Amino acid sequence: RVADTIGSGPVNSESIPALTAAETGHTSQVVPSDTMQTRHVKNYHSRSESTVENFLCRSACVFYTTYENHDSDGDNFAYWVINTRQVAQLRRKLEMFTYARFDLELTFVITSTQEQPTVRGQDAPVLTHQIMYVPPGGPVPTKVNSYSWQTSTNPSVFWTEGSAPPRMSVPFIGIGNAYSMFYDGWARFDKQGTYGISTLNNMGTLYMRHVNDGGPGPIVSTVRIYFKPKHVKTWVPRPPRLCQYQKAGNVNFEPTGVTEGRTDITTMKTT
Amino acid sequence: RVADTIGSGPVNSESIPALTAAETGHTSQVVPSDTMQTRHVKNYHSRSESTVENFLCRSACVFYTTYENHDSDGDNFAYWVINTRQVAQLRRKLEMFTYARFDLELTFVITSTQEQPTVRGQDAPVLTHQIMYVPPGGPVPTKVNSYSWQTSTNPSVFWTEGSAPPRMSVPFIGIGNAYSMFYDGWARFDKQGTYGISTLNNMGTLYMRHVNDGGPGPIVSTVRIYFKPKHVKTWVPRPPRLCQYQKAGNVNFEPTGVTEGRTDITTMKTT
Amino acid sequence: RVADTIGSGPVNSESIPALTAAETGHTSQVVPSDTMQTRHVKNYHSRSESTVENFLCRSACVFYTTYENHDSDGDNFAYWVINTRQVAQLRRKLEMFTYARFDLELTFVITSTQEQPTVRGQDAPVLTHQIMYVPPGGPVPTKVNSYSWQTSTNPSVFWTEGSAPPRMSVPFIGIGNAYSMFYDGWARFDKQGTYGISTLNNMGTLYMRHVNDGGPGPIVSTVRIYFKPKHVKTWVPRPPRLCQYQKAGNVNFEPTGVTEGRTDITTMKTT
Amino acid sequence: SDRVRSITLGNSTITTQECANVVVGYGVWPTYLKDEEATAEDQPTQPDVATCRFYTLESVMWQQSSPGWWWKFPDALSNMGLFGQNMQYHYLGRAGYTIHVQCNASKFHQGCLLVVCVPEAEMGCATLANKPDPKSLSKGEIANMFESQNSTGETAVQANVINAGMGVGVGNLTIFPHQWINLRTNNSATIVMPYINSVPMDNMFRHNNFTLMVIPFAPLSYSTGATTYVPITVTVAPMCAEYNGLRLAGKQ
Amino acid sequence: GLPTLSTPGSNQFLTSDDFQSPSAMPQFDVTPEMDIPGQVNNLMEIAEVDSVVPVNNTEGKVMSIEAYQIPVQSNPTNGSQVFGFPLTPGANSVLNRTLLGEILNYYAHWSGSIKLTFMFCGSAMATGKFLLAYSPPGAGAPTTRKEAMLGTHVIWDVGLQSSCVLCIPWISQTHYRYVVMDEYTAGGYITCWYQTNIVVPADAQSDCKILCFVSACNDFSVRMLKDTPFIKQDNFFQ
Amino acid sequence: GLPTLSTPGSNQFLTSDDFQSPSAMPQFDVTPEMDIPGQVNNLMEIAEVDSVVPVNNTEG
Amino acid sequence: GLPTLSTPGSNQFLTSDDFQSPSAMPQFDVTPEMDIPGQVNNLMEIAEVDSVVPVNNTEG
Amino acid sequence: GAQVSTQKTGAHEIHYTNINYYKDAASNSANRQDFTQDPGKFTEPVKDIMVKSMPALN
Amino acid sequence: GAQVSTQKTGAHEIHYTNINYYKDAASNSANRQDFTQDPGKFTEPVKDIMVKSMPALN
Amino acid sequence: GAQVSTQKTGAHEIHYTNINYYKDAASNSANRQDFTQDPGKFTEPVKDIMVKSMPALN
Ligand SMILES: CCCCCCCCCCCCC/C=C/[C@@H](O)[C@H](N)CO
Ligand SMILES: CCCCCCCCCCCCC/C=C/[C@@H](O)[C@H](N)CO
Numbered sequence A, B, C: 001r002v003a004d005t006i007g008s009g010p011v012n013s014e015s016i017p018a019l020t021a022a023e024t025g026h027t028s029q030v031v032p033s034d035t036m037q038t039r040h041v042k043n044y045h046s047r048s049e050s051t052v053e054n055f056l057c058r059s060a061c062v063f064y065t066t067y068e069n070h071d072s073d074g075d076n077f078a079y080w081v082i083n084t085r086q087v088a089q090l091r092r093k094l095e096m097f098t099y100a101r102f103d104l105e106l107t108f109v110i111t112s113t114q115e116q117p118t119v120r121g122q123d124a125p126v127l128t129h130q131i132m133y134v135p136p137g138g139p140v141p142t143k144v145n146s147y148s149w150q151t152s153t154n155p156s157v158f159w160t161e162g163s164a165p166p167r168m169s170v171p172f173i174g175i176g177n178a179y180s181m182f183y184d185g186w187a188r189f190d191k192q193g194t195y196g197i198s199t200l201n202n203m204g205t206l207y208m209r210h211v212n213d214g215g216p217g218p219i220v221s222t223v224r225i226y227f228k229p230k231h232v233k234t235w236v237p238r239p240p241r242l243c244q245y246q247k248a249g250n251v252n253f254e255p256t257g258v259t260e261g262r263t264d265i266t267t268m269k270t271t
Numbered sequence D: 001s002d003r004v005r006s007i008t009l010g011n012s013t014i015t016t017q018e019c020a021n022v023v024v025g026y027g028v029w030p031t032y033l034k035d036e037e038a039t040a041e042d043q044p045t046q047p048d049v050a051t052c053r054f055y056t057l058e059s060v061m062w063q064q065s066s067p068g069w070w071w072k073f074p075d076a077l078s079n080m081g082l083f084g085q086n087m088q089y090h091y092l093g094r095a096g097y098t099i100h101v102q103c104n105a106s107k108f109h110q111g112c113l114l115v116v117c118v119p120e121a122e123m124g125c126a127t128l129a130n131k132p133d134p135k136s137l138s139k140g141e142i143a144n145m146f147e148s149q150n151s152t153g154e155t156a157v158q159a160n161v162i163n164a165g166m167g168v169g170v171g172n173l174t175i176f177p178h179q180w181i182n183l184r185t186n187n188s189a190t191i192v193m194p195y196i197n198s199v200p201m202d203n204m205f206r207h208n209n210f211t212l213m214v215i216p217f218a219p220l221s222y223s224t225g226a227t228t229y230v231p232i233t234v235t236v237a238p239m240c241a242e243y244n245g246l247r248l249a250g251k252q
Numbered sequence E: 001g002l003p004t005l006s007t008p009g010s011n012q013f014l015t016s017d018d019f020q021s022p023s024a025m026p027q028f029d030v031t032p033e034m035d036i037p038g039q040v041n042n043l044m045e046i047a048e049v050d051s052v053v054p055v056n057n058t059e060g061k062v063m064s065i066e067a068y069q070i071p072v073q074s075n076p077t078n079g080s081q082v083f084g085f086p087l088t089p090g091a092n093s094v095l096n097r098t099l100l101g102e103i104l105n106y107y108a109h110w111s112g113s114i115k116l117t118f119m120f121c122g123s124a125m126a127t128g129k130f131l132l133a134y135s136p137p138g139a140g141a142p143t144t145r146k147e148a149m150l151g152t153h154v155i156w157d158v159g160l161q162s163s164c165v166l167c168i169p170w171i172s173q174t175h176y177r178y179v180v181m182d183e184y185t186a187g188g189y190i191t192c193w194y195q196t197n198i199v200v201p202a203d204a205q206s207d208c209k210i211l212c213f214v215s216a217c218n219d220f221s222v223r224m225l226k227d228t229p230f231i232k233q234d235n236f237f238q
Numbered sequence F, G: 001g002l003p004t005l006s007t008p009g010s011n012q013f014l015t016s017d018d019f020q021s022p023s024a025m026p027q028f029d030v031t032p033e034m035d036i037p038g039q040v041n042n043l044m045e046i047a048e049v050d051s052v053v054p055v056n057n058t059e060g
Numbered sequence H, I, J: 001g002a003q004v005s006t007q008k009t010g011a012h013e014i015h016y017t018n019i020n021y022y023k024d025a026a027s028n029s030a031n032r033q034d035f036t037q038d039p040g041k042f043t044e045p046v047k048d049i050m051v052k053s054m055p056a057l058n
């Protein structure tokens, strides 16, 4: 909830609220009552929707990729090394903070489409997909039927088409006390090698495939991945990203103007 | 939960923590504080995830096989004699212990595919499968429509495509006080005959088939079987399997090196 | 739960437990302790699974029949006069008792298949079936669209394909105080006419059909019927059926040997 | 004092001049079967002093090339006096054992043995499609030997030491009850093994239970002049042996 | 019917899910528990047990009991290095195959102190002092005893107590290191050097072996289950 | 609606399942129990009864 | 089974929904919180901070 | 009116909860927990008892 | 262990009920009701307070 | 007969609720909360204790 504006009247003092020294690096706590005659207003406005949690807590696509029912070996299955920097939207939000701690709610939207070399009497049974998460170090699949798909330990989801977006919750899996959105440092003590946020990035890889083996007609499926931070804690706010993004692994940017321009410091015409 | 490291300082005693006699077959209970100056650390790390239950309690494919809608008599239906040794992953985990006792959660992922001699106007109604468990001794099916599929006593599951992995729980059905993962003995008192773990193996057979009889176009369905130990108790831990597996019914192996090698006992270059 | 074996020692008495007179038609209540030196054993074995209820309480197919989407008038719909004697399995179990009283849980597995005169652009909407129970005396259907299918009073189930086995519970609907599995008598006082268990059999008829009327391509559906006795009470146990069954309406049998044979009364070789 | 030791079982006593402690099973000490754990109903025989005593097996010589040896229990004791006779007449039996491995050298000698008891040591065949034969598995009171190269044989046990005949790193045999005999400090190892099995009792001919393995991790070594004959003797005592199911004798 | 609304997640089969499920065998009477020696409850009970480390895992020695034997002998020089390997228990060949390494391989993160025990297998007449050390990362690996000595070290003196313990403290900037090998998560170097020399009388071997064991200390824990890269398969065994 | 989430197992038909199910004949009044001699509760009551063993089961 | 009736909304995936969901990593032990200076709870804490306004935003 | 019973647990080392939702007793689940047992009907229907340690025919 | 909270209702003119069904806190719904607020960290990090009606630079 | 336990929460800064619906203990969920731990069986099976600060071989 917000502040009531308390009624105030005439003044003729030597207390000067309006005059300060911004050099101190301190934001003035002035309110209308200090510089004009105010009436009393009982303010009921709440700041419920600007809470960091409500700000970040909405599912956002972080990526998508495709794989095919049949066609052999790249095509057959797909994989994605988890990271939140390949999309503009979410990435800019998380990036309004330097460090953050949160749980995640993953939701997957999986859709399928038919490809042109059609075939007659094509009548395919429903499709079931499998998504497997391979923590750093785990044996990774090499083709749609590698032994690793038996997932005796890696977690996986098997989902059938037409049945509602599979979903899971994942804890704060970070190894530090928070996820770092920025890292002005290197991976190696000699500073040779990578520099920047990518040095920290090691959250594993997702692997997806069709379970029912390839039928006559070719089918392509796309897996859209959604992230939803939950139970959010965020520290050290920073300016929102100005320059558009260029690369997923660093902050590289093309210089850009501070704002749009207008004709003179006197123009009321809103752009 | 783990131990706090208690702060320690200088020493000049005749108590020698660092010196022991490993000949005793006893592992030293030393901690940092015994050999260096330690600061106090309140450790909050928990060992929740290394509990035997959380280690084994994740569904793992133990096998899969196929059968066809139409095509006659081998093809028509499938069967599997239950055992956990035909897969590398799970088998190696259970095998980190000599004896174990646990319940099981079976989950089946069943998928179907169309085969090439297609036919026109192929528009097949949804498929329903039946899986039947035949305890040792029960009359076993001989073709897709044998009387035994009436299951008046054997348990069976009927499941329709597109509706979520059928699942059941099965108790510790062993006849001993635990399942033995190893058995250095024979089935016969005269030692003629089989030797090894297979002498104990008698858990029955699974039988699967399509229920709707064969339509025009050929269809092949694969049944993937998942095992998930629950309510686990495990005794006599053993070294993890080094040599790869060769056979499902015994421990036969090809000798193999203890580790990968490196150039000298002085090389810091991690392989 | 079972009996503990109580420890016993040497004896030299004139009490003779081992010697009896089976002529009395009385089974000896001897236990190991009476004829040998026993150690004490606390027995935890339970007889939970041999309770009459757990023995009979598992769904069993009692019949199945078929009908077609299109094709006219026999084919169009099917019917079955309810009885439990057309299957070997269940029938032999119920028959281990002379009289029984129980409720029933009916489950139906309905599957459909395409027939050969296929047609192009065959794309059939999902199928809905109707099963109607016609108590003795009720007007019975004569074709797929007879007035009787309006079921203002007979109970019926309408079920759509792909949605999980329809199921109902039916009380002990018998008119006597129990269902008789045997009846050594006649239906008529003059003994002319039928003799045997069939004289009692009058439980009505089931009628099934497709609801959506016949489309271009022919489709055949099979209805498998499952019976599961519940809340079971059983009297006068009898010997299990030796000879195979020949007829559904009587006990007619082909004489058969008491057991398999072996070479001599001295052969330990299990057959 | 306390490196010295004396153990009396039956009419036999063992003494040691330089031991470590005595490693005890998995902390469990052997004991007869409890009525709550029992299933066979007949009254057991518990001979005692006549069967639970120290039996000394054949000695073996440690040479600078020996890869190791192994013996299987109860097998190794199937011919030792009354313990063996009881095994023959009974369908079932169970027992624990105190195992005492002996090996004295000199101060100028060096070497170090791993002495382990591996419960349920199923072994692999040298040729993948076969099963080893009874004798490749156990030669009774006569030690079988590991080899320092892949064994070949059409029915032999794949005895290359590095995988201890089981397909595992020999260096991890350590999670099993063991001691070391580092000649520099020790001269014997004593291990008490409780009865470990997934059933209360078992037939003693068709199941082995545990295998004693003696494997040198640092080879016997010495300067010329020093005695080259360094035997390793194994003395074992059944503990709390009971049998059930008496009948005529033999295997079959 | 009770008005209900299905949520995303319905009907999926997640391998690490935890729900109840009907039993296919109602009223089945299990066989009474027994009481077998050696029950295990946490993989960490296993990782806390010493296993012999194959320090001498050079080329041809890797298929020999020799992989386990560290060579030590009398020398005409001072402060020679006996051995050296990095603190990368999950991924380095020296450590990754021990009981500790095998368990680490079923996980993605680890944390804790580790104990390395050295057992001298010379003869009773041999003597010698060694300097065992651990050096956190950042600077290189020590190439001389004067460099190693400036870090965490213990000076082992051979005598009645054949064995001696170098305990490696957990000094990381993180809390958890990956078992997987990352330069970010570098753990330092373990090395050993002669403090004096192996002095022996005439008629006693000057060449000796030293065995080295590993196990976790009481602050050790692993996190994040994953499958091991150590067991492959081409198709169902038969 | 009460937010719900379906689990594996939904819609299967396991022959040894044990659930409630609607009765097709609501309020049906069953016929009073009687009291017939020889009730049986456990198959073991039957197995505890002597039966004549065909020891002489040779050939003919 | 408990008689149930599904309502409109079932199975949809609304991006701003708020339901519970199974955790893919059961019993995962997170790393202890720390206490970093500068925690933020509401975007308004940021909007309440002075930023330099580019009033002279003409052309070049 | 929830009924709490005991699960089949095993012997050498817990409750459920059921609520009936239908108006008819026939709709109820199975009576899988009825362990009554009386062999005497078939094993000893003899009018004059018959003691074990005694001479069966006097 | 049902928890009853308050719904966002509005201001110039009611409760819910939640039961957690999973063993892991990460499975729980969002903390959409946490209204803590402290601008002072960023708006007034000055060591010597700074009163409004007063001469900022003395 | 609802059982309320504690969720895995984390350490430097809540309950669930479960009701079992099946007659068989095997139908129950996992025992993911059993944290018993005893290394002594394997780490110190020595009959004569072994103190740390003491001379291992007397
Ligand atoms: C069965 C599917 C399981 C799926 C498991 C996914 C786990 C990955 C969660 C990642 C949360 C990452 C958010 C990004 C953090 C990075 O910004 C920082 N560079 C790390 O400090
Ligand atoms: C309707 C489907 C019912 C399915 C019933 C499956 C029952 C089988 C459970 C088997 C658990 C076996 C795990 C393996 C144990 C073996 O390692 C040992 N050799 C036995 O001592």
Ligand SMILES: CCCCCCCCCCCCC/C=C/[C@@H](O)[C@H](N)CO
Pocket: C082, C083, C084, C104, C106, C131, C132, C133, C155, C156, C157, C168, C170, C173, C174, C178, C179, C180, C181, C197, C200, C201, C203, F024
């Ligand atoms: C909407 C579908 C309703 C289905 C109703 C089915 C009712 C029939 C129940 C029959 C139970 C019969 C078991 C057999 C009993 C016979 O053995 C005896 N001959 C009768 O005394």
